[PDB]
């Protein structure tokens with residue numbers, strides 16, 4: 330796999346989770362952005378792959394698992410088989426990426442999207458090669474118990490814009506946020 334993508338929503342104090350859920354109230358269009366970005370592929374015959382940790386998997390409501398229209402892969406060192414509803418299980422990101430090139434998935438996967446949590450982001454962000462980070466900056470502090478790792482600006486560049494991503498400040502339920510895209514190349 331020649332490139333990876335991460336996607337996250339983060340508060341001002343770098344929080345991504347609290348008590349197994351989001352630190353802020355649910356933001357519908359922010360969620361719809363996550364859905365659009367991770368689901369959309371114009372390559373006929375293929376789907377995108379979402380990779381996530383075990384806690385992130387169980388944070389998704391049962392009725393919404395697996396994430397529709399995407400191949401769902403869960404990372405765990407302890408499970409022997411995927412959690413019920415998930416399509417695949419791997420012990421590591423690198424193992425996950427090798428799996429996509431074996432016969433079952435060979436001709437089936439377009440984009441790869443890392444969707445959390447902290448440890449999966451940390452690993453992905455240090456993976457060699459081209460990687461983009463789609464980061465929604467929630468422009469307030471929220472009490473959090475799970476945090477997004479620091480973005481290394483020696484490696485990552487804030488892109489000034491990105492096709493299909495809105496540039497202006499957004500607001501839903503009185504909460505301001507903005508969509509950012511970062512990239513590294515080595």
Ligand SMILES: NC(=O)C1=CN([C@@H]2O[C@H](COP(=O)(O)OP(=O)(O)OC[C@H]3O[C@@H](n4cnc5c(N)ncnc54)[C@H](OP(=O)(O)O)[C@@H]3O)[C@@H](O)[C@H]2O)C=CC1
Nearest residue numbers: 337338345346349350382383384385405406445446447448
């Ligand atoms: N705001 C946002 O964008 C997002 C928020 N969230 C929030 O974050 C929280 C969940 O995230 P977090 O607590 O960080 O947990 P994770 O989703 O990363 O799950 C942790 C578990 O996943 C497995 N795992 C994680 N990383 C790896 C690794 N790279 N290799 C192999 N296995 C791995 C391990 O399972 P095992 O013990 O079985 O080995 C580990 O104990 C929730 O509050 C959720 O709501 C989650 C995603 C994004």
Ligand SMILES: [C]C1=NC([N])=NC([N])=C1[C]C1234B567B89%10B%11%12%13B85%14B%1158B%12%11%15B%139%12B%1061B%12%112C5%153B%14874
Nearest residue numbers: 336337338359360363388389444445465
């Ligand atoms: C709100 C959000 N927004 C962005 N831009 N990126 C994310 N990674 C998330 C966090 C999400 B959503 B969907 B489920 B649902 B649950 B699981 B899956 B995605 B993971 C958590 B919530």
